Amino acid sequence: QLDSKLNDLKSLLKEIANNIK
Amino acid sequence: QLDSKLNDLKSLLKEIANNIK
């Protein structure tokens, strides 16, 4: 469960990077 | 503890992205 939570939080960085650009 | 530490470090990227924008 913790590994899945970390993986899910990972995509937030990509989403933020896409939004900023 | 290590998983929690990694999760906490994760939010730093989002904070930096918000600050830069």
mmCIF file of C-alpha atoms in Angstrom:
data_model
loop_
_atom_site.group_PDB
_atom_site.id
_atom_site.type_symbol
_atom_site.label_atom_id
_atom_site.label_comp_id
_atom_site.label_asym_id
_atom_site.label_seq_id
_atom_site.Cartn_x
_atom_site.Cartn_y
_atom_site.Cartn_z
ATOM 1 C CA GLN A 1 0.000 0.000 0.000
ATOM 2 C CA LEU A 2 2.793 2.449 0.862
ATOM 3 C CA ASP A 3 4.626 1.658 -2.377
ATOM 4 C CA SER A 4 1.418 2.297 -4.322
ATOM 5 C CA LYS A 5 0.912 5.572 -2.444
ATOM 6 C CA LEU A 6 4.428 6.718 -3.347
ATOM 7 C CA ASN A 7 3.877 5.740 -6.981
ATOM 8 C CA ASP A 8 0.616 7.702 -7.081
ATOM 9 C CA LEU A 9 2.292 10.756 -5.550
ATOM 10 C CA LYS A 10 4.976 10.456 -8.235
ATOM 11 C CA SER A 11 2.594 11.441 -11.051
ATOM 12 C CA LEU A 12 1.841 14.724 -9.261
ATOM 13 C CA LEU A 13 5.286 16.032 -10.220
ATOM 14 C CA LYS A 14 4.680 15.263 -13.900
ATOM 15 C CA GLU A 15 1.235 16.874 -13.745
ATOM 16 C CA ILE A 16 2.667 20.020 -12.137
ATOM 17 C CA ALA A 17 5.473 20.183 -14.703
ATOM 18 C CA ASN A 18 2.966 19.890 -17.551
ATOM 19 C CA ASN A 19 0.745 22.576 -16.014
ATOM 20 C CA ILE A 20 3.639 25.004 -15.499
ATOM 21 C CA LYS A 21 4.843 24.678 -19.100
ATOM 22 C CA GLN B 1 10.310 5.043 8.693
ATOM 23 C CA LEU B 2 12.253 5.135 5.413
ATOM 24 C CA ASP B 3 9.036 4.974 3.385
ATOM 25 C CA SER B 4 7.644 7.883 5.407
ATOM 26 C CA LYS B 5 10.874 9.827 4.867
ATOM 27 C CA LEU B 6 10.641 9.310 1.103
ATOM 28 C CA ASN B 7 6.988 10.370 1.124
ATOM 29 C CA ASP B 8 7.852 13.532 3.061
ATOM 30 C CA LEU B 9 10.672 14.361 0.644
ATOM 31 C CA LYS B 10 8.177 13.914 -2.200
ATOM 32 C CA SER B 11 6.192 17.036 -1.256
ATOM 33 C CA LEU B 12 9.350 19.146 -1.609
ATOM 34 C CA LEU B 13 9.146 18.810 -5.395
ATOM 35 C CA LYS B 14 5.554 20.076 -5.430
ATOM 36 C CA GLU B 15 6.470 22.957 -3.118
ATOM 37 C CA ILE B 16 9.403 23.946 -5.345
ATOM 38 C CA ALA B 17 7.238 23.738 -8.468
ATOM 39 C CA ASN B 18 4.604 25.968 -6.863
ATOM 40 C CA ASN B 19 7.250 28.470 -5.746
ATOM 41 C CA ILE B 20 8.879 28.640 -9.189
ATOM 42 C CA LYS B 21 5.572 29.300 -10.964
#
